[PDB]
Design a protein around this ligand. Structure first.
Ligand SMILES: Nc1ncnc2c1ncn2[C@@H]1O[C@H](COP(=O)(O)OP(=O)(O)O)[C@@H](O)[C@H]1O
Ligand SMILES: Nc1ncnc2c1ncn2[C@@H]1O[C@H](COP(=O)(O)OP(=O)(O)O)[C@@H](O)[C@H]1O
Ligand SMILES: [Mg+2]
Ligand SMILES: [Mg+2]
Lengths: 74, 375, 160, 133, 82, 375, 82
């Protein structure tokens, strides 16, 4: 519902994480370290998202069992 | 199932919303189309009381609600409530997001244009479907019978319309739409019950009167003989238990409620009954296709489920029609869902797959696209 | 399981005081020398506060499975755990939800009798009269052959 | 019918189910480790100038931003699922679980354990008032 | 002696209260005994009758299946007749 | 406990003031609400004689006092005495200054407005509480049962009222408030005891008659059979020892005192008994929620503690009601404190935490704020 | 005073016995309350399931009646068309 506000919020959050770097604010070794830091953050995010997907699978389980119970009420 | 994409065959109707995926035998979710706000004050805190119960939930809490149908006679009179009903239908009764499914609504004949245009605008802007198509409620009922000719009398709950079709060519000048339907029969039954002492007034008790009508009323084969019999014997008086006890006994109100269909003068309507508007609809057709229409008269819609109507109607038409023609009335047992079964069949066809109103087409011509070639 | 955690958590300020008071009051000796190995019941009688009967029954049954008839200081701590409400209180409802999800890893919308059958086959427990009887009673709570979520939901509720 | 056997079977089933749940958790941890391992990008850092380093950094940042966008979309979907699950939970509560309030309270604190002290204090006050004369 | 007598009066009132406790406990317990027995009997009867209804319902299912099949047959005959 | 702030759930009642902190099982201090000035002269000097003994202190010196209840029938007739009672309740029975605690009073339905407004004005000006809220005494008794529907008959000591509730939506047009309660039963018992020779006149001896009523009286399952049995045998005559000896024997006065509840013609009241005002309160409700109200009839209040009332009332309602409905009477053992337990539960809710009448709101709109949205 | 002390100690032991009887009655009360709560819950479930069964039996009976009557009519018509 109201996809415009959701899109605006997602774009704002992405712009918050718009980690664009300058030219003389880092080093080449520092740039590699930043790349590895982003890699590790993405891996932690992937683990969190996989846990979220498992939790959403359990949410689907709860959804179907609850709708089944509600239909069983009548 | 799996890949691919299935169509949503929704059917707004007026009284029962019937929906389900294309290609099945019966609608997946059938529930009354009523939206009822609570009317009392409410003292318990934190009970989780919502502001509007829609669908089948408001038929269980109807004791403290004010149910109000959003569709009066085919046309839609309250667009916010109709949007709420559609949202419920998509998300809670089918649990399929509309962003990935074509929709096939249904509409009565001779309805206002603005209703249809607003319907398509809602479906394309709010729910954001990929493509939707609007079809006349009688052609589908003709699909479901497996015929290709015949004159179909689709006596729903909102409006009764009678569309004749021959060899697939609809006759637009012979559609006879009459606004007597199940709702007026419910009101008339509620009005004649007062002759014994039972008074139903609240909009919630209209549902109880509807249940009485469904379970007890029947159409008499001959009206005067039944009126004479019910006034002498007592073999007709059937009793029924209200939702709280205090059983009631319905006498000759049983066959007087649905008799209004064949004599609309009972509720003050001028027009002729459903037995004579069919004959008039036939006589407007050409002289060479009248035999086929006589032989393939089709019944559909909910209100044509009264026990004994397929014989009364045949007797009446045989009285009106010439003596040589054979009069046959097709009354399939799956009458109530005939329109939706036909809708599923139509949506499952390969030849029909390019008739949908694609979204880019709507973006180029606006909501008035529905009246154009994509009908 | 939670029994060992309860035994460890026996060491506190309240239950230690209860144990010390019980020892100072009705743990002295100077009896007739009958060897009162069943003094656990005597401790229950002198407790003055009767816990839930399940705790007392489990204390009488589950301990000294070898029939030793002798209780150590660790067993004194276990008995004092049984005195107060040191139970896990039906474990965590999250555990029941995770168990139900693992049962419905096949996404059947409920715990099918096949799930309990294969779990019983894996555990190898002897098929007694209560075996299958309990499965049919819980699954057919409506006695219509349909197994609903609430059946095993409340069946697994109230226990640790 | 056998209460002892019923309790034994229930306890054994609970323990074996817990062991299976722990095995499933270990399997999930292994799957997560596999996913983290297979999600790394094979990249080279030989013979690339700092302009190429900046270009690679911008490409990796774009991919990270895309992954974050997808994660936020999935988080929104899971939040919607959580809201509808809570709606179903309160539906069940009003259908059957309305008796939570007489369960969520504090009982048996002092009224059920300290009640004779009032009578004792009343008697002592009466005795003191008598002795005042 | 007067202090001892005061003590005695206190003990007397406490004994009175104790007997009062005994009587009220007995009365409530007998009440709950009555309710327990009535509830148990009614529960037994209700379970019995419900199971009876279930059996009758299954029989009705089978009857309905028979009738449905026979109606299919008669319908085929009628349409061929047409 | 510790930081944070707990609410005071006071419950004025009429006959017993019940108070205690929110979130417990039973009220902390329960004591009669009577204020009795001494009436004799007094000759001992320096005895420390006060001018008014309130609460449970005046039930021990009642031999030389003139006890007078400050609440007649729900309404408060003597505001100074009620203020004294509240001051005692806060400072001596709970020992918590009211400057740091919200309060939740309770009020009978259909009471005069001025009573409620004066109550809130006192609580905000004299005791200077942070925030107070007034709740109807029947909704709380419905909270305590853990239900959300049901019709609750709260027969207190001042006034008997019968509030039906469905799904959390109270029905304001179906509240039947009747002014027969425990006090009138005490007066009638004191009036029929004179038929054996025992005369109680002093306002102190009304307490003795109340004790007789509590300990001996019971409600007969069938009135005429009991009247016939007590007039032939002598198996009913139970004796009781007055505060000075001279035991008395109560014959058929045992079940005639509480019979007034079901036949208010005994004390000259016109209205129908508590067995028929419940049925009338149900019949005013809508036709679709009568089954639920029939099945969830709730009893509360002190006067419904007579041994054998939950069967007499069920028999009477089953006689009145249709034969199909099931009549069930919920009579929890903690009947007397049911209202206060419900009050504790309501005050402990998180959803309710923003409904209090905050002091700044009272400063802006005056005492008439209670009738406004913050009910 | 000696006699009074004797009576004091006798009432003292009596009071202790009274307190113990009180606690025993209290425990019994809690127990029976628990039992009654359980059995009543079972009563609720039994009644509700009985009602479900009865309703379903009613519906199946009615449908059987309707279909049977239709089949009989069509049988008569089959003979007629013969
Ligand atoms: N078995 C039945 N017997 C008699 N009338 C019925 C029966 N079932 C439905 N009706 C009437 O038909 C109406 C439902 O018609 P329906 O075909 O659902 O309308 P719509 O065309 O809007 O879907 C109900 O309002 C009811 O009055
Ligand atoms: N055990 C009992 N048996 C009979 N009557 C009782 C009993 N306890 C209290 N009552 C009556 O109920 C009254 C107390 O009612 P209560 O619920 O305290 O009123 P309120 O609603 O003002 O608090 C007493 O005046 C007494 O007459
Ligand atoms: Mg229709
Ligand atoms: Mg009260």
């Amino acid at each position: 519902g109201k996809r415009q506000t959701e899109r605006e919020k997602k774009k704002k959050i992405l712009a918050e994480r718009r980690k664009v770097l300058a030219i003389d604010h880092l080093n080449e070794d520092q740039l590699r370290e930043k790349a590895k830091e982003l890699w590790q953050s993405i891996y932690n995010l992937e683990a969190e998202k996989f846990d979220l997907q498992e939790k959403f699978k359990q949410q689907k389980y709860e959804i179907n069992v609850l709708r089944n119970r509600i239909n069983d009420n009548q | 199932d799996d890949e691919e994409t299935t169509a949503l065959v929704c059917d707004n109707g007026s009284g029962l919303v019937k929906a389900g995926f294309a290609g099945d035998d019966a609608p997946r979710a059938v529930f009354p189309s009523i939206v009822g706000r609570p009317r009392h004050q409410g003292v318990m805190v934190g009970m989780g009381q919502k502001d509007s119960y829609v669908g089948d939930e408001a038929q269980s809490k109807r004791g403290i609600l004010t149910l109000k149908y959003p569709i009066e006679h085919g046309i839609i009179t309250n667009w916010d409530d109709m949007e709420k009903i559609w949202h419920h239908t998509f998300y809670n009764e089918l649990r399929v997001a509309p962003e990935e499914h074509p929709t096939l609504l249904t509409e009565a004949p001779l309805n206002p244009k603005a209703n249809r245009e607003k319907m398509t605008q809602i479906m394309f802007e709010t729910f954001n479907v990929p493509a939707m198509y609007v079809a006349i409620q009688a052609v589908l009922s003709l699909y479901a019978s497996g015929r290709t000719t015949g004159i179909v009398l689709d006596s729903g709950d909102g409006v009764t319309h009678n569309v004749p079709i021959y060899e697939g060519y609809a006759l637009p000048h012979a559609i006879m739409r009459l606004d007597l339907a199940g709702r007026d029969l419910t009101d008339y039954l509620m009005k004649i019950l007062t002759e014994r002492g039972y008074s139903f007034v609240t909009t919630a008790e209209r549902e109880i009167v509807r249940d009485i009508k469904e379970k007890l009323c029947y159409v008499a084969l001959d009206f005067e003989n039944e009126m004479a019999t019910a006034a002498s014997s007592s073999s007709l008086e059937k009793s029924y238990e209200l939702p709280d006890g205090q059983v009631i006994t319905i006498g000759n109100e049983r066959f007087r409620c649905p008799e209004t269909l064949f004599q609309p003068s009972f509720i003050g309507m001028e027009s002729a009954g459903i037995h004579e508007t069919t004959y008039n609809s036939i006589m407007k057709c050409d002289i060479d296709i009248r035999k086929d229409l006589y032989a393939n008269n089709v019944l559909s819609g909910g209100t044509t489920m009264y026990p004994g109507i397929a014989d009364r109607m045949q007797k009446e038409i045989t009285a009106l029609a010439p003596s040589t023609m054979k009069i046959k009335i097709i009354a399939p047992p799956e009458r109530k869902y005939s329109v939706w079964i036909g809708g599923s069949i139509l949506a499952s066809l390969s030849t029909f797959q390019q008739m949908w109103i694609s979204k880019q087409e709507y973006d180029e011509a606006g909501p008035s696209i529905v009246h154009r070639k994509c009908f | 399981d939670d029994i060992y955690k309860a035994a460890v958590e026996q060491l506190t300020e309240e239950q230690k005081n209860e144990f010390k008071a019980a020892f100072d009051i009705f743990v002295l000796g100077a009896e007739d020398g009958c060897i009162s190995t069943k003094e656990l019941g005597k401790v229950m009688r002198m407790l003055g506060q009767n816990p839930t009967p399940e705790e007392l029954q489990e204390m009488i049954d589950e301990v000294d499975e070898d029939g030793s008839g002798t209780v150590d200081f660790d067993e004194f701590l276990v008995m004092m755990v049984r005195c107060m409400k040191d139970d896990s209180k039906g474990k965590s409802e999250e555990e029941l939800s995770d168990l139900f999800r693992m049962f419905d890893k096949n996404a059947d919308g409920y715990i099918d009798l096949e799930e309990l059958k294969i779990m019983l086959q894996a555990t190898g427990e002897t098929i007694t009269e209560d075996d299958i009887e309990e499965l049919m009673k819980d699954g057919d709570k409506n006695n219509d052959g349909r197994i609903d979520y609430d059946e095993f939901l409340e069946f697994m509720k109230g226990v640790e | 019918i056998s209460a002892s056997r019923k309790l034994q079977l229930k306890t054994l089933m609970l323990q074996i189910a817990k062991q299976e749940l722990e095995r499933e958790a270990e399997e999930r941890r292994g799957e997560k480790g596999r996913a983290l391992s297979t999600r790394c990008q094979p990249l080279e850092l030989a013979g690339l100038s700092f302009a190429e380093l900046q270009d690679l950094c911008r490409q990796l940042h774009a991919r990270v931003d895309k992954v974050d966008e997808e994660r936020y979309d999935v988080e929104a979907k899971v939040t919607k699922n959580i809201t509808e699950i809570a709606d179903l939970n309160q539906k069940i509560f009003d259908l059957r679980g309305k008796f939570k309030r007489p369960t969520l309270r504090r009982v048996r604190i002092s009224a059920d354990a300290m009640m004779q002290a009032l009578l004792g204090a009343r008697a002592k006050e009466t005795l003191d008032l008598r002795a005042h004369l | 002696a007067q202090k001892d007598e005061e003590k005695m009066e206190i003990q007397e009132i406490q004994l009175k209260e104790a007997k009062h406790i005994a009587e009220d406990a007995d009365r409530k317990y007998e009440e709950v005994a009555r309710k327990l027995v009535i509830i148990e009997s009614d529960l037994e009867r209700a379970e019995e009758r419900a199971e009876l209804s279930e059996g009758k319902c299954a029989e009705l299912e089978e009857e309905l299946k028979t009738v449905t099949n026979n109606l299919k047959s008669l319908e085929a005959q009628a349409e061929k007749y047409s």
